[PDB]
Write an enzyme that holds these catalytic residues in place. Sequence first.
Site, PDB file in Angstrom:
ATOM      1  N   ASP A  74       0.776  -1.251   0.000  1.00 37.58           N
ATOM      2  CA  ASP A  74       0.000   0.000   0.000  1.00 37.58           C
ATOM      3  C   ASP A  74       0.811   1.307   0.000  1.00 37.58           C
ATOM      4  O   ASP A  74       0.222   2.355  -0.250  1.00 37.58           O
ATOM      5  CB  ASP A  74      -0.971   0.015   1.195  1.00 37.58           C
ATOM      6  CG  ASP A  74      -2.401  -0.436   0.870  1.00 37.58           C
ATOM      7  OD1 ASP A  74      -2.767  -0.552  -0.321  1.00 37.58           O
ATOM      8  OD2 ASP A  74      -3.170  -0.621   1.837  1.00 37.58           O
ATOM      9  N   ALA A  75       2.127   1.304   0.226  1.00 39.95           N
ATOM     10  CA  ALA A  75       2.939   2.524   0.288  1.00 39.95           C
ATOM     11  C   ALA A  75       2.698   3.530  -0.849  1.00 39.95           C
ATOM     12  O   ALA A  75       2.477   4.707  -0.594  1.00 39.95           O
ATOM     13  CB  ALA A  75       4.419   2.132   0.341  1.00 39.95           C
TER      14      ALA A  75
END
Lengths: 69, 52, 52, 83, 83, 83, 83, 83, 83, 83, 83, 83, 83, 286
Positions: free
Chosen positions: D60-61
């Site tokens: 998800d970064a």
Amino acid sequence: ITVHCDIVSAEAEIFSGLVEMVIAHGALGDLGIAPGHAPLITDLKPGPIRLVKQGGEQEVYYISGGFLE
Amino acid sequence: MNINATLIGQSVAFFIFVLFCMKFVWPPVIAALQERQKKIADGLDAANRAAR
Amino acid sequence: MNINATLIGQSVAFFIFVLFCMKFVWPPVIAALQERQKKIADGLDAANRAAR
Amino acid sequence: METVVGLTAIAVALLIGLGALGTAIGFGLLGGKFLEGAARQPEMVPMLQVKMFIVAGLLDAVTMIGVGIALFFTFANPFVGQI
Amino acid sequence: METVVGLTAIAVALLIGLGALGTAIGFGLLGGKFLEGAARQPEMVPMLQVKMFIVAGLLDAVTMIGVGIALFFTFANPFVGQI
Amino acid sequence: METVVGLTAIAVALLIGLGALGTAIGFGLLGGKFLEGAARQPEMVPMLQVKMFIVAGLLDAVTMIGVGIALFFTFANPFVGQI
Amino acid sequence: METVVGLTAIAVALLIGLGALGTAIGFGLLGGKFLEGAARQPEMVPMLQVKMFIVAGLLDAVTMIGVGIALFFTFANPFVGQI
Amino acid sequence: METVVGLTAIAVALLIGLGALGTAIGFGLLGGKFLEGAARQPEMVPMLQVKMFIVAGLLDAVTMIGVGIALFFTFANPFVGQI
Amino acid sequence: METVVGLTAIAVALLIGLGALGTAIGFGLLGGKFLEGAARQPEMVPMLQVKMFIVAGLLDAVTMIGVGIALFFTFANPFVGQI
Amino acid sequence: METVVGLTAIAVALLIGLGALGTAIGFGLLGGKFLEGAARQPEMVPMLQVKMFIVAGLLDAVTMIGVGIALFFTFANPFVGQI
Amino acid sequence: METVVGLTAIAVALLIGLGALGTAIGFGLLGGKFLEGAARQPEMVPMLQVKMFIVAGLLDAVTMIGVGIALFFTFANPFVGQI
Amino acid sequence: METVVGLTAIAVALLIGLGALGTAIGFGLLGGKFLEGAARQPEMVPMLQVKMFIVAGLLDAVTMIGVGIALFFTFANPFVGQI
Amino acid sequence: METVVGLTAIAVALLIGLGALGTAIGFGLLGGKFLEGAARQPEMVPMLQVKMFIVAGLLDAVTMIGVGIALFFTFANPFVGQI
Amino acid sequence: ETASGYIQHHLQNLTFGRLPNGDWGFAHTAEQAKEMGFWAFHVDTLGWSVLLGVVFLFIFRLAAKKATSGQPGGLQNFVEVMVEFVDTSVKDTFHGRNPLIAPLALTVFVWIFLLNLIDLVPVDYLPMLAAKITGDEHLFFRAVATTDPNATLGLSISVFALIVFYSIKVKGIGGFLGELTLHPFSSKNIVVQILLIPVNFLLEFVTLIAKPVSLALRLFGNMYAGELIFILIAVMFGSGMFLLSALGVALNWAWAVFHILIITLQAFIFMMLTIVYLSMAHEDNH
Ligand SMILES: [Zn+2]
């Protein structure tokens, strides 16, 4: 909650009774078997098999390889 | 002018590449070529031994 | 003129080099490989015959 | 203003939409393997859950940067000041 | 002026959106195999974790280039200076 | 105003549609592995079902933000006021 | 002028963004199979790591050509000179 | 009104079309694993069929929100009332 | 004339971008199978490596027909002559 | 009048085309595992076949709404009366 | 002329780009099975190779019909003759 | 008039192109499993062929609808009369 | 007429580029399973090859209709005669 | 001069042809060459391909005219390693008695490798040396011959002639047309095999004509993209800056280290697919 595990060799029986969980070192990775697991045939590595009996008792037999059915 | 700088930039880059090539990329090929020459010579020596 | 007759200019050069290689480069070198295989084979056969 | 403001609504939809699409498929792949591992050896579940959350951070970064930029262009607007 | 600025907002959304989409799918493929290996060989998880972070830098190399270029276009549009 | 308003209708379609596409493929991957694990270990189903709902919360996280922003752009509109 | 300049900004996002998407899915596919071999055969790791870097060079080959023609388009412009 | 109405037809096609695409691929993945488990253990089919419908509800959830918003944009129109 | 020049920049980006995307996913599939085969039996690595390079010539064939044509559209231009 | 009718022809191609794409891939996935199960357990083919039709009904559910709406837009356009 | 010629450069980029994408993924799938077959049966390698080159003729046929019509549109033009 | 006719050629291309893409991949997935099953049980091939043809009917159903609506839009176009 | 003829050039790329993309991936999947079966059962190879060509006809059926209609739109034009 | 002019000059060939008045002269501009028709020659491509082909055969002849059949010298050790590598490559694919297949593969591999290797020397050295030796300042001169689609098309159209030749020579005229129309979709009955002859022809003809094109354009696309990146890295030095002429040297080195792997691999792919396509023209593969 328990199944009939039977550890046997070509010469004699190693264990026979009722168990809650069976931990084995398979040829393709470790396994953790509990009641109602699906049909499975597997090649075992040389190492210790850990069994859990109802309740808290932990058998740790050393085996030189074999087949888990 | 700008054209002269292109020849200088190309020349230094080619020299460092040729250095890397002749000092590290080529030596293993010399070894691979000479080792085959040794293995061929030793086989012919063994064939001469059998004749004697 | 400008682009496509080079398609036959390169094709003619290719076929000439292939026929030259087939007669004056490949046969003289492959024969040396055939001979050495027999030079080693004759040594192994002579050793077995001499022992018997 | 009309062309810059209308094409900024499309930009915001692509940022969150491509992020949502990738994050949903990425967790289907990662989570499907967590359940497969949990079924192979039931006593490994406590370790596998912590290892899954470490990977979830890597997964998800970039989507979180995309959601942050999409909410930046929605309430503030750098392009409208550039004219 | 509006068409260069408006199309820049969409260029920005395409760079971070396509990067977010690919890294989430790629880290679920990579991370899914990290959890499968960890469930099968729990004594090797310290090694597998280091080998996974070496593939993580390769998987995020071109995506971090896209994120840097996207922020450059937003806070320093290099096309508005080209008439 | 007619081009801003009409491009927010495509923004909303992209924002809900790309989320729906990802969430359907993601749950096909997660659910197919849950059935495989449930068939292998029937006594672990109570635990695997709870672990599937942990992943379902990560899988839909960005998709729910996309549906929330798409409903915000449908009944209210930040672009109509030129921001 | 404005159409060539705005449509070259979208050409840079397609060059760097489509390469970012491919490189991230390709390295998740190749590194997943590397972590699978390193668990199955922990002794072959040093050898498999070298063979992975050889295939990495083939994966990131057309992507670096596109990331380099897209930096040529942001700092120079072969299209502007054609009027 | 003409371009807002024309772009609402495409918005509806993307909502229903992306939802139809994802749901068909998602059930193809979830469905194949149900048949695989059913062939190996025909006694488990009653349980596996109930577990499949729990996943089927999660899989179609966002797709059905998309179809609900698309029918609303077709028989009514929240954009036309905004000019 | 600006339409022909601007649409050539997009044509070059699509022609190099779709090749960068296909070659990275296509060799990450093949590379993983090569590492898997190497792990199964490291005695066959030299032979398998030679076979992988013969498939690398079939896999990257049409992607290089498009990278050559794209670099012929950036410097030369067959569409400008056609008016 | 002409933009609404031109854009609704593309809306019909998106509704049927995206549904056709997804359902063809979905049945390839579902049907591939039906044949695998039938080849593994020849005596179970009449049991696996009825289960395949239960999934087939779910797989095509949203696709049939898509073609239903597409044929409604083709013969009884609902957008041409909204301008 | 300017649109018919500029939309033929986009036509050419889709004929060679979509073919470049499908042949690099198709030869990455075909080749991945050839390398495993070459490991499972080391003595069958010469047979597996001749059979893989028969499949390769079917795999690239439609792609090669497209690299021809694209080269025919780049050096001749069937559309410009229609004004 | 020209817009409707031009955008009806794009509709035909999408109805047949998207259908062709899905059908090709769907038969690649289905047919691949038919060969796997036939190799394992060569005595069941007569039964597997009829079962594959049952699935083939489902797989091409919506593709055949789209290819009939695309040859209808081509000859005696339904949208021309509407304007 | 310039918009109908220019949009027809793009329709043709979609009709052949999508077909090229689909058949290349479809044969990669089909052919990959043929090499897998050929490696396990080298006695079955002549039977498996006949069954592979039966499937190849189903895989390219729609794709051929697409290239047949694409060539028809280049050397004739049913849209230009309808304006 | 400007960067656009620098790049446009590197992409033009030394053309010789029918000027407005006479079939004897070199074109002085790109446009003066585009005016010229179909009957054509590139004097820089044909001057490097023939010279490197003769240098290769001369060095290999020096190692064949005195072959020892015993202990090998330094030069013939290398030539035997090349002959044995090619013979092994041909025996693992072709099982027949044809004497042309092996020397063709050795000629193709070593010649194409040399035509590609000259790309490593700086791109302005040979063009400026040719200009200085001639006394001109606008002389077109391209050294890498595989960056010319005509050179690569001539190399694959000759291999295609050998494929159509051997296919008719061993299968007969009937066997050639038989493969082209009765395979792969061979029906068990006569009423259907005739409704599959139009199909078998399209698929086998597209596959037969696509082998020459794919062989020429895979080699052209990998070499034209390789030299074009070297020309763009040379434009970094034209800036006159320090932090750009330092990044350019590092990129030039990394590109040359990557390109030698591609130069080696492209020669290998052309040889192996020439062996495979000639071996499948000698047997019925179906
Ligand atoms: Zn044959």
